[PDB]
Design a protein around this ligand. Structure first.
Ligand SMILES: Cc1cc(O)c2cccc(F)c2n1
Length: 209
């Protein structure tokens, strides 16, 4: 059973701006998604200080980067707090509304797309390099869900029957045809060193076979 939802108007316009604007500095998508993972890991770590049982679903706090040339996907996995169905459908969009309005005002005043994270909507920079984004996520208080969107104004949510995750978020970037440089090991290493070198969790770059 797949549910289809319309993005809020303002988030749809943000997605179209990210997809349609000419802007060559696309590599910042990775810093933004790693920042998302770090924030999610911070959150479950803090909550575990007063309720250790929140780590029964997994004690390790880490980030994995997994390129796949055969599928043309780059996957960012973290064992953070995860997202609930209400997060995916309602809560995150409510936050992204005011962040989008502020980001677009800043752009018209002279800011550039690389500053998207200062407005809390860095997740959407995934569409600099991805034609489709799939998010698998499991929060301690909810079921495992798959969220998916190819932009165009709509996203889907369903219950995920795939391999159980324990706790956390997997972001699967289905890369655009001309963006395969981000499946190369040396390229990913360069970007992580440049933009994410002080992240407070182990980042493991998987090698392909
Ligand atoms: C971090 C983050 C922020 C958002 O607005 C999202 C919206 C839909 C799905 C996501 F995974 C999201 N993640």
């Amino acid at each position: 059973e797949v549910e289809t939802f319309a993005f809020q108007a303002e988030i749809a316009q943000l997605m179209s701006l990210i997809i349609n604007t000419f802007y060559s500095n696309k590599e910042i998508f990775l810093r933004e998604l790693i920042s998302n993972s770090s924030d999610a890991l911070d959150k479950i770590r803090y909550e575990s200080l007063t309720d250790p049982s929140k780590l029964d679903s997994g004690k390790e706090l880490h980030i994995n980067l997994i390129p796949n040339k055969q599928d043309r996907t780059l996957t960012i996995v973290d064992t953070g707090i995860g997202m609930t169905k209400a997060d995916l459908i309602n809560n995150l969009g409510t936050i992204a509304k005011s962040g989008t309005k502020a980001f677009m005002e800043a752009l018209q005043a002279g800011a550039d797309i690389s500053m998207i994270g200062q407005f809390g909507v860095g997740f959407y920079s995934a569409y600099l390099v991805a034609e489709k984004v799939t998010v698998i996520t499991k929060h301690n208080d909810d079921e495992q869900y798959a969220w998916e969107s190819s932009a165009g104004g709509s996203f889907t949510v369903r219950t995920d029957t795939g391999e159980p995750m324990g706790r956390g978020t997997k972001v699967i970037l289905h890369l655009k045809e001309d963006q395969t440089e981000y499946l190369e090991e040396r390229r990913i290493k360069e970007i992580v060193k440049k933009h994410s070198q002080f992240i407070g969790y182990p980042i493991t770059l998987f090698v392909e076979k």
